Every structure is written in structure tokens, then in C-alpha cells.
Amino acid sequence: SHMLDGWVPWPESFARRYRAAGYWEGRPLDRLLRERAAADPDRIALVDAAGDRWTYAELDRHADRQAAGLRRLGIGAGDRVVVQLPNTDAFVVLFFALLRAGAVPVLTLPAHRESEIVHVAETAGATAYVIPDVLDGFDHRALARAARKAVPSIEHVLVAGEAAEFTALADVDAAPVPLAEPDPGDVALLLLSGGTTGKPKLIPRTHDDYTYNVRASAEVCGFDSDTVYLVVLPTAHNFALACPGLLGTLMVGGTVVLAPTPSPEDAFELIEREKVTATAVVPPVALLWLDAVEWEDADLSSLRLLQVGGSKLGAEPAARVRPALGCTLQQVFGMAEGLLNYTRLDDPSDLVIQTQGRPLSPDDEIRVVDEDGRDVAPGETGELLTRGPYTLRGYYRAPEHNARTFSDDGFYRTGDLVRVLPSGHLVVEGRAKDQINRGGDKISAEELENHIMAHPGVHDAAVVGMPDATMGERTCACLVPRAGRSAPAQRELAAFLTDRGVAAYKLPDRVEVMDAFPRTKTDKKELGRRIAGQ
Ligand SMILES: Cc1cccc(O)c1C(=O)OP(=O)(O)OC[C@@H]1O[C@@H](n2cnc3c(N)ncnc32)[C@H](O)[C@@H]1O
Ligand SMILES: [Mg+2]
Structure with missing residues (x-):
């Protein structure tokens, strides 16, 4: 029995093996903050672009108060809540507050507009929608009015800013109340994929598989309490949220620093000011930063790790990361659907420059198939299919697409064309989708x-x-x-x-x-x- 319908649980034999292997630890996702605030209450958990900061105890307490306020509005166990927020402390508090209330965050991007918002709110039957007031010149409150008109299930709109006729997110606050924990095998949150159909598809991620995603990523990337992580991509992007992202930083006791934009102006200043040691960017921003250090005077020396993923970083700019940015490059070929490939931090420079990593989990299963669906000879190019302890068995409420996109034995068809090298490292070669x-x-x-x-x-x-x-x-x-x-x-x-x-x-x-x-x-x-x- 599960709290939500419309998703596809793992077969019991796989669940058993992932629990026995120690991947699925049986803890709600919000427990990563609860446990860190218990061990390290006075460490600095979060810093915003202005330079305000919060300890783990302060962040944990605030999530509890906002969780209790959410319950006062009737937002709770199982309700899907569309979240569209900038890289501010409001997102971080609300994320954990929604979890502790038992709500299921549906994470959208600030750039999404009525078409995407109405579709995901419709598909999820969402009861609430969280927005900024005005962001990058666009008034999201008008979008919320349009969303409420098209989706009657939306009862509440919570606004980070001037709330107009709606509810101010800062007012969602109450004395903490005993709140029941969710089942770790249940859906924790819903991610958005670009998809390949006429509607964006929602990706259900459970407590156990997302905690594993975060925890194993933190291990591979060397995140610990010495990590200062700059959130440059949107907080709702899987890369910046969980790979290892801000959740991995908080899990291990580091410091999350929120960047308002990826520009050198904003990011280079925060790197110097907060002594950032790790961050994650898409290759266009990597190229921009690699140029910008030649005319920017910022001290970026604290940077130790630059993750680059989302499209293929070329081998020539990849080789420039150490000379120009003074840090280690890590190529990441990931997807909100699950499978993460990472270069290892001590991989020979050849593999950091030339490959897009090897899979995160020992039980990430890889198949590379030709147009007929048969396995290619090793080193041939074909479509990547994958199955593992944090890759979905089906999209949310998409039966017909699930029938097309997952093999009979549960392999997700990525639509990516890849080679696998003798070391197990992947080279991304193109796309089929x-x-x-x-x-x-x-x-x-x-x-x-x-x-x-x-x-x-x-x-x-x-x-x-x-x-x-x-x-x-x-x-x-x-x-x-x-x-x-x-x-x-x-x-x-x-x-x-x-x-x-x-x-x-x-x-x-x-x-x-x-x-x-x-x-x-x-x-x-x-x-x-x-x-x-x-
Ligand atoms: C980047 C990333 C890291 C961690 C968690 C994520 O979730 C994501 C992310 O990008 O999430 P997406 O949902 O956009 O997944 C769509 C995916 O992007 C393409 N891709 C992704 N990294 C690529 C790369 N290093 N080199 C070439 N191609 C790449 C594929 O097409 C693939 O399927
Ligand atoms: Mg026409």
C-alpha cells in the first residue's frame, strides 16, 4: 500500500536487494536535515546571495514551523504542491516543510509558464502552488491566477513576496506540532523531465531512492562538512538539488550558498566571499566562466570541484578547467529519471577530459542496444537502457508512455546514444530521442x-x-x-x-x-x- 497512485513501484525482489545492499536505508528524505541539525546544530547550513545565513538548528526549526503552518492551511499528507521559486532561502525551508507536512513537492523551474504549470498541476491534481511575486521581470501572480482558472484543485497560492489576494509564504508559520513520518518507500517528490511527448512527464522519486541518490553522490564527490557548495543552477534542477547538490551538502554538514544567477558577476563574487569549494554548471556556463577569469579579478582559489553536465562538455575546454579555474573537473551525465554517471575525482585526467563518467551505483545496470534492440558489441555506439536503485520504473500517471519507454523487464530507455569503454566509463555520442x-x-x-x-x-x-x-x-x-x-x-x-x-x-x-x-x-x-x- 502506497500513499499515491499513478506510479510504478519496484518489483519486490529488487526492493529486497536494494535494502539488503544498504542503498535503501528506510529514512524519510527530511531526516537528512533532522539528523545533521542534531549532530551539528550550530554549523552554518545556508547562506543567501545577500549574505544572510542560518545554522542547521535554525533551518531545522524553521522547517518545523512552516510545516505546522502548512497543516493549518490543510496542506498535508499526500497533497501535491507545485513549487516555483528562485534560488533563495525560501525554497530550502519550504522544501523540508512540505516534506515534514507529508506533502509531495512538484518541482518546476522559474522559467516555466502557463502551459507547463497547468499541465503539471493538472496531472498531479495539485492543491497548492508556490510562486515568487515578480521574478526576472515576470509577475508570477498573474500566472497563478491563470493556473487557478484552469486547474480547480488549486486551493492555495503561497507567494514569496507581496502576496496580493493570496497567502504570503512568510505567514505560513505556526508552533511546531507532532507530525507523522512518511513511509520511505512512498513517493517523496515529483521532478519534471523535458520528455519526448506532447506533455512534460512527472518523475516520482521515493524517500529511499532519493536519499541514496544524495548520499552516494556525496560520497563519490567527496562532499563533507568542509564543503561549501554554490547553487548556480535552479534549486529545482536534479543536478543542483541532489547530485549531490544542496541536499548532499546539508546531509554531510557543509554550507549551501545560493547564487541568484550564473553570471561571473554574481557567482565569482560569492565564490570569493564564501570560499566556495564546489559547484555544478551546464557547459555553456563553464565556457563563460573559462573566458571570464581572463578579465575578472575575483579570487576563485577556494574552488576545488567544478561539476559540468547537461550536455557534452568538449575535450578542449575540459582540459582548460585546471589551468584556468584552478580546480578539478568532474563530468556528470545524469537525468532526473535516475542514472547518474560521474567521473571520479582521482580519475586520470584523460578520462576526466574524454568521458562522461561511469555509473554511480554498483547495481546500476547498463545495456547499449542497436536499432533492433540487441546488445551492441563492446565499444559500439547504441542507445543506453538502464535499471537501478534510483531509476524509475515508470513516469507518474503516464501509462501509455510508460509502455513505450520501459522494456518488459523494467529497463528505462534513455534516448541517449553512448559507447561504453573497457573501464566502464561512458562516452556520450548523440541522441535518439x-x-x-x-x-x-x-x-x-x-x-x-x-x-x-x-x-x-x-x-x-x-x-x-x-x-x-x-x-x-x-x-x-x-x-x-x-x-x-x-x-x-x-x-x-x-x-x-x-x-x-x-x-x-x-x-x-x-x-x-x-x-x-x-x-x-x-x-x-x-x-x-x-x-x-x-
Ligand atoms: C546533467 C545532470 C546531472 C545530474 C542530474 C541531472 O538530472 C542532470 C540532467 O541534465 O537532468 P535531465 O532531466 O535534463 O536529463 C536529460 C539528460 O541530459 C543529457 N545529459 C545530461 N548530462 C549530459 C552530459 N554530461 N553529457 C551529455 N549529455 C548529457 C541526456 O539527454 C540525458 O537524458
Ligand atoms: Mg494552425
């Missing part, structure tokens, strides 16, 4: 195509990735015009999609109008050629 990787941001082609086809001048749309030297891929929207109408140009299409509530990283970089698409279904390899003029 119909999803564009734009600087680490994942763009489901089918979701974007359906948005574009809603435009009155558009009859058909095929979204095609274009190689880019610093962004990895850009987005080209190939358009068949509506019968007797003109298709829009780039700027009109972007305005249409923004008004429709499409996150800005999904806006096409380029529009190409044509009479028909090549057919094999649409042949996107041939579309690439026609786009390139060949």
Missing part, C-alpha cells in the same frame, strides 16, 4: 510542434535541432503554412508562444517555411539537410 538539448535545456519537439501548430498561419510544424558550438543545439521550427495563409516569422511566433505560456528556452531560434516535410513520418535528418541548404 526527438528532443533538442539547447545548452542543457531539454525541448520536447512534439510539445513545441503542437504549440506552433495552434498558430492560425501554421498547418504543420517540425522542430529540428541545429548544431551550435557554444549552446550545443539551437531550435529550428520548420513550418508548412496554413492553406492560403502566411506562416509567421521568428518574432511573431515567439510572441504567440510566450502569450500561450511556453517557457522562453523553447522559443525557436529560427523559422524555415516550406511546402511539405520529407517523409520516411517526418524525416528530421533530411530536414536538417534542407535547413543547411544541402
Whole structure:
């Protein structure tokens, strides 16, 4: 028996083996903060961009008060709560407060707009939605009004800032109350994947598998109480939350430092000020930092570890990380679905430069298969399938997609093309899935195509990735015009999609109008050629 329906538990024989192996320890995710605050109450747990800071005891106490306040509003055992917050201390407190109340956080990104928010709130039957007031010039309260109109289950909107007619997140506060613990085998939180279908898919992560994710990642990355970790990616990104991210830093007793943006201005200042020793970035930001040290005077010497993942970091900039940034590079090929590959901190420099790591767990199972589904010869390129103690057996409330995306014996089909080397290290070689990787941001082609086809001048749309030297891929929207109408140009299409509530990283970089698409279904390899003029 589980608190939520709509997800796919592990078969009992696998659960047994993961508990016996010590992976699944039987503790709720919030216990990592409870235990650290009990052992190290006066250590500095969290520092925000302004320079305010909190001890483990202070953070633990505040999570308890906000948990009790959430219960006063009726937010509790099993309720799904959409969270959309910036990199501020409000997120960290609310994350643990939701857990201790028994609510299930549904983590979205600040950049998400009405289309994504309404879909995940709908799919999760969410009862509450947590927003900033205004962030990066966008008023999220209007989005919450639009979300409430489309999703009647949303009863509460909690605002970090001026709450307008809603509830101020700072007012969610009460005397702590005895709160029951959740079952560690139950879903702890729901992550968002870019996906490959017409809707983003929700990833259920349980207490046991996410604690293992965090704990084993912290071990491999050498996180301990001496770690000062700079959250440069959004707190809701799996990379920065749990790999090992801020949760790993808190588990082991380090200091989490929140960066408001990844710019050198903000990040280089916080690295020097707080003596940051570790952080995680996407390759476009790695390239930006590698340039910026040549004109920035910040002392970055405290940096010991730079994790880079989300798209493939090239071998040439990878080799520059030690000379330029004075730290160890760790390549990370991970996914919110589960499987994490890490280079080890003492791997020979060859493997740090040339590979995307080897799997985190001894019981991460790897298969590399050809177009027919048969295992490739060792060292051949094929699609990566994987199964393990923290990789899902199915997406949340997506039966039909689950039937397509998981093999009969439970292997998740990643859509990534890889080689496995004799050492077990992976080299990422490409993608099989119909999803564009734009600087680490994942763009489901089918979701974007359906948005574009809603435009009155558009009859058909095929979204095609274009190689880019610093962004990895850009987005080209190939358009068949509506019968007797003109298709829009780039700027009109972007305005249409923004008004429709499409996150800005999904806006096409380029529009190409044509009479028909090549057919094999649409042949996107041939579309690439026609786009390139060949
Ligand atoms: C980066 C990361 C670290 C830890 C936890 C995460 O969760 C994530 C993350 O990126 O989460 P995503 O959900 O975006 O997963 C989509 C994934 O990104 C692609 N990818 C990811 N790292 C890659 C790399 N180092 N080199 C080439 N490609 C990579 C694949 O396509 C794959 O499937
Ligand atoms: Mg149309």
C-alpha cells in the first residue's frame, strides 16, 4: 500500500536487494536535515546571495514551523504542491516543510509558464502552488491566477513576496506540532523531465531512492562538512538539488550558498566571499566562466570541484578547467529519471577530459542496444537502457508512455546514444530521442510542434535541432503554412508562444517555411539537410 497512485513501484525482489545492499536505508528524505541539525546544530547550513545565513538548528526549526503552518492551511499528507521559486532561502525551508507536512513537492523551474504549470498541476491534481511575486521581470501572480482558472484543485497560492489576494509564504508559520513520518518507500517528490511527448512527464522519486541518490553522490564527490557548495543552477534542477547538490551538502554538514544567477558577476563574487569549494554548471556556463577569469579579478582559489553536465562538455575546454579555474573537473551525465554517471575525482585526467563518467551505483545496470534492440558489441555506439536503485520504473500517471519507454523487464530507455569503454566509463555520442538539448535545456519537439501548430498561419510544424558550438543545439521550427495563409516569422511566433505560456528556452531560434516535410513520418535528418541548404 502506497500513499499515491499513478506510479510504478519496484518489483519486490529488487526492493529486497536494494535494502539488503544498504542503498535503501528506510529514512524519510527530511531526516537528512533532522539528523545533521542534531549532530551539528550550530554549523552554518545556508547562506543567501545577500549574505544572510542560518545554522542547521535554525533551518531545522524553521522547517518545523512552516510545516505546522502548512497543516493549518490543510496542506498535508499526500497533497501535491507545485513549487516555483528562485534560488533563495525560501525554497530550502519550504522544501523540508512540505516534506515534514507529508506533502509531495512538484518541482518546476522559474522559467516555466502557463502551459507547463497547468499541465503539471493538472496531472498531479495539485492543491497548492508556490510562486515568487515578480521574478526576472515576470509577475508570477498573474500566472497563478491563470493556473487557478484552469486547474480547480488549486486551493492555495503561497507567494514569496507581496502576496496580493493570496497567502504570503512568510505567514505560513505556526508552533511546531507532532507530525507523522512518511513511509520511505512512498513517493517523496515529483521532478519534471523535458520528455519526448506532447506533455512534460512527472518523475516520482521515493524517500529511499532519493536519499541514496544524495548520499552516494556525496560520497563519490567527496562532499563533507568542509564543503561549501554554490547553487548556480535552479534549486529545482536534479543536478543542483541532489547530485549531490544542496541536499548532499546539508546531509554531510557543509554550507549551501545560493547564487541568484550564473553570471561571473554574481557567482565569482560569492565564490570569493564564501570560499566556495564546489559547484555544478551546464557547459555553456563553464565556457563563460573559462573566458571570464581572463578579465575578472575575483579570487576563485577556494574552488576545488567544478561539476559540468547537461550536455557534452568538449575535450578542449575540459582540459582548460585546471589551468584556468584552478580546480578539478568532474563530468556528470545524469537525468532526473535516475542514472547518474560521474567521473571520479582521482580519475586520470584523460578520462576526466574524454568521458562522461561511469555509473554511480554498483547495481546500476547498463545495456547499449542497436536499432533492433540487441546488445551492441563492446565499444559500439547504441542507445543506453538502464535499471537501478534510483531509476524509475515508470513516469507518474503516464501509462501509455510508460509502455513505450520501459522494456518488459523494467529497463528505462534513455534516448541517449553512448559507447561504453573497457573501464566502464561512458562516452556520450548523440541522441535518439526527438528532443533538442539547447545548452542543457531539454525541448520536447512534439510539445513545441503542437504549440506552433495552434498558430492560425501554421498547418504543420517540425522542430529540428541545429548544431551550435557554444549552446550545443539551437531550435529550428520548420513550418508548412496554413492553406492560403502566411506562416509567421521568428518574432511573431515567439510572441504567440510566450502569450500561450511556453517557457522562453523553447522559443525557436529560427523559422524555415516550406511546402511539405520529407517523409520516411517526418524525416528530421533530411530536414536538417534542407535547413543547411544541402
Ligand atoms: C546533467 C545532470 C546531472 C545530474 C542530474 C541531472 O538530472 C542532470 C540532467 O541534465 O537532468 P535531465 O532531466 O535534463 O536529463 C536529460 C539528460 O541530459 C543529457 N545529459 C545530461 N548530462 C549530459 C552530459 N554530461 N553529457 C551529455 N549529455 C548529457 C541526456 O539527454 C540525458 O537524458
Ligand atoms: Mg494552425
